[PDB]
Ligand binder design. Structure first.
Ligand SMILES: CC(=O)N[C@H]1[C@H]([C@H](O)[C@H](O)CO)O[C@@](O[C@H]2[C@@H](O)[C@@H](CO)O[C@@H](O[C@H]3[C@H](O)[C@@H](O)[C@H](O)O[C@@H]3CO)[C@@H]2O)(C(=O)O)C[C@@H]1O
Ligand SMILES: CC(=O)N[C@H]1[C@H]([C@H](O)[C@H](O)CO)O[C@@](O[C@H]2[C@@H](O)[C@@H](CO)O[C@@H](O[C@H]3[C@H](O)[C@@H](O)[C@H](O)O[C@@H]3CO)[C@@H]2O)(C(=O)O)C[C@@H]1O
Lengths: 367, 97, 154, 149, 110
């Protein structure tokens, strides 16, 4: 009978992969999407054989140095790159009626880098502790580290700054300041090139050595991370399934996936692993989990129907090519407009204008 | 669309040449008389899908990692609309080996 | 005492009824640090005010505590040490909806009114099940009902 | 039946660059201004050729050490210096008839130093990790650091 | 780009219409550390909800971001690196009292 009623918890409709989304949800109906990005810095996945790719998978190949000040060309696997992806979500409803639509708005997100345990393997052939008698421990990952990530309703807006604008990045297989702005680098790039701005349109492509989350005066991504320089510097990490974070903005908004896609982006350098063959100081990274919580938000449609509707129907029309009733040489000498009916003026050649607000019996031309 | 799709095949069999056994075969044509009306349905479409289309225009194409596909790195999804009293074992359904 | 930590990690399954926490502090000479104290407690209480519910009637404690290596003044054989961890769990009795369907139990005996079948795939990567739809209510007719709910299928 | 009403948010009025300010902003108007300063310590901008200026732009040139307790010469390009600037907002008051003028007041500010990633370039030419066989990593930036504003 | 940091400091006056801050992290090998964030805003508002006032419609941003020495694979030319800084200044319109009504010599040279 009245066996006491358990606590009220939110009711899960269905779980499973992305398709679960497919299902009509309703309007408060939240979605939880766990996923993750694997750390793609250097050696790609494909050389599946642990011999041919030596399975440096998730490892900077070797570290390609430089000739000297004059020549510094890295390698395309001596280069850890910005890891990312986009989740494709369902489309929600409209109301051309009240010109308002709902979008996929992320709220919070738990994330976590996993595998910090892996850096407890201390056999294997790295430089030993005691080089001398060639003994000890095969030295753990150490060195500079960097973890940064973002979550957005559009790709990550970034900015390039580099150490030496002379680095011989390859035009091929990586996006460099050049690759984006055709022309070469300048000292400016090297510090804050307001030109050297790109988008995270690719993946495992723009290296982190260049591209940075640019605090564009504008953003629908939330991101963060940090640098920790150094050579021996100890790796440190956070194992926890306890904490969530708020993509919510200052007005209680979070991102909104324009283009029903959610965008995850991040980087997780732990530091250099070091061989014995030499100081082939190549570096490691770890994967990152993601638990995005997004709801359905009703928003004022931005751009007016007509515009789109009829912007299109005007783009349908035959393209005309013809004489200039525009630009710098309009064959149009003049235009007036009237609606009212004032009584006769005096000076018929009078003018009239309206400015940042109001209308005026233009000044008697006689200034 | 606003389209009616007729589709067919009408093999009668092999026409065989008094020559050899060039069994090269024959078919006949077909007539259709469709009787069709006008029926009101509910728009299957969300018009500002185009607003979304616009966003997908202004919004670049990514390559980017697999969040769909066979090797999707989407680990899981759940949706919740209501409030059910705390379930015992939330995930205990059809047991099959 | 089997899963080497070296390999295994607390996987943030989409789903979890455990609370784990921990940290990695790397290095070769890295100095140890701890917190000798009985003062504060930690809440396993979940997002909805729940905490773990010992399914089965069990409570599962799991942990690891590497402190770093002890190096033999012999050669350079490090072989590391760890310490023990105490736990003081506070548990209450909670009411939930029933999870155990006796029909399963009793119909565990239904697949015994019939044997075990091999037979073609209708679950797997080869499910020769091309399709399932479920209908319940009633809506007026839609145009294309199999609407590409995803923007890109346009 | 009706219309759902999206959450209220501060309505944008105009955006772009400094010109925007010119709009008769009204009084409870608010202005957001994003800008940035480049770190002018050491090498000045000007010698754009990364051969003539080496393009040390954004770097102390060399390290003009001293001669002795008696002698210490700086070397002006061995000298990180205070970077600053001035945004010139528009004039707000106009009715002087009143003992009440109005002026720009700063409220908060997000700020971020960018490019920590840059310091991940470990190739190039810096003292290597292994000096000996000249191997390893062209050793990253290291040392005393200071940030203020 | 003139007063060198090595010499000049944010002198805490008696009076100040600027908020400032930063820190020194001494050392030779000392690793660098930084903060990548989009999320946090800071309040220039003062103890009385005043923050600064662009007396003379100018807003004055100032900063310094030394990261440490880049050491040339050569000798020990320790020349040191710096980085740039973003600013999002949030500012409103505040009301005040006309100062000029303090007559001729009553304020002139006072
Ligand atoms: C087991 C082992 O010694 N692994 C090394 C490898 C191997 O030496 C080899 O490259 C793969 O079997 O080298 C690693 O670093 C390499 C990396 O920097 C790549 C970048 O392209 O270059 C390798 O040497 C190059 C050389 O720089 C090129 O000019 C030349 O065209 O090809 C050479 C390789 O054939 C570096 O050795 C690596 O992971 O591949 C580091 C491992 O420790
Ligand atoms: C790749 C490299 O090692 N670059 C060096 C440079 C080069 O040696 C230089 O660019 C060659 O033209 O030297 C750097 O150190 C210089 C720096 O300490 C400045 C400080 O003023 O002095 C230079 O020597 C001066 C000398 O002190 C002056 O009295 C004289 O008038 O001019 C000399 C230079 O021609 C140091 O060489 C440099 O930044 O230029 C350090 C770089 O790492």
């Amino acid at each position: 009978k009245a066996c006491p009623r358990p606590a009220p918890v939110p009711k899960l409709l269905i779980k499973g992969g992305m398709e679960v989304l497919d299902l009509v949800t309703g309007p408060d109906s939240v979605t939880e999407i766990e996923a993750f990005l694997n750390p793609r810095m250097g050696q790609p996945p494909t050389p599946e054989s642990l011999t041919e790719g030596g399975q440096y998978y998730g490892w900077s190949r070797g570290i390609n140095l430089a000739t000297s000040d004059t020549e510094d060309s890295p390698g395309n696997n001596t280069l850890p790159t910005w890891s990312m992806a986009k989740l494709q979500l369902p489309m929600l409803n409209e109301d051309l009626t009240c010109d308002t639509l709902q979008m996929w708005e992320a709220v919070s997100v738990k994330t976590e880098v996993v595998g910090s345990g892996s850096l407890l393997d201390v056999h294997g052939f790295n430089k030993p502790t005691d080089t001398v008698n060639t003994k000890g421990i095969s030295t753990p990952v150490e060195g500079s580290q960097y973890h940064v990530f973002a979550v957005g309703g559009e790709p990550l807006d970034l900015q390039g700054l580099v150490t030496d604008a002379r680095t011989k990045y390859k035009e091929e297989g990586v996006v460099t300041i050049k690759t984006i702005t055709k022309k070469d680098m300048v000292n400016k790039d090297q510090v804050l090139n307001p030109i050297s701005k790109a988008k995270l349109d690719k993946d495992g492509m723009y290296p982190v050595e260049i591209w940075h989350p640019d605090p564009a005066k504008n953003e629908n991504t939330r991101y963060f991370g940090n640098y920790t320089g150094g050579t021996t510097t100890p790796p440190v990490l956070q194992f926890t399934n306890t904490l969530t974070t708020v993509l919510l903005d200052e007005n209680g908004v979070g991102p909104l996936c324009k283009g029903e896609g959610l965008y995850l982006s991040c980087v997780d350098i732990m530091g250099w692993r070091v061989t014995r063959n030499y100081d082939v100081h190549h570096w490691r990274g770890l994967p990152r989990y993601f638990k995005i919580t997004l709801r359905k938000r009703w928003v004022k449609n931005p751009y007016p129907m007509a515009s789109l509707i009829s912007s299109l129907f005007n783009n349908m029309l035959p393209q005309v090519q013809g004489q200039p009733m525009e630009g710098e040489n309009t064959q149009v000498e003049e235009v007036r407009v009237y609606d009212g009916t004032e009584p006769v003026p005096g000076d018929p050649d009078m003018t009239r204008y309206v400015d940042r607000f109001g209308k005026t019996k233009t000044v008697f031309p006689g200034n």
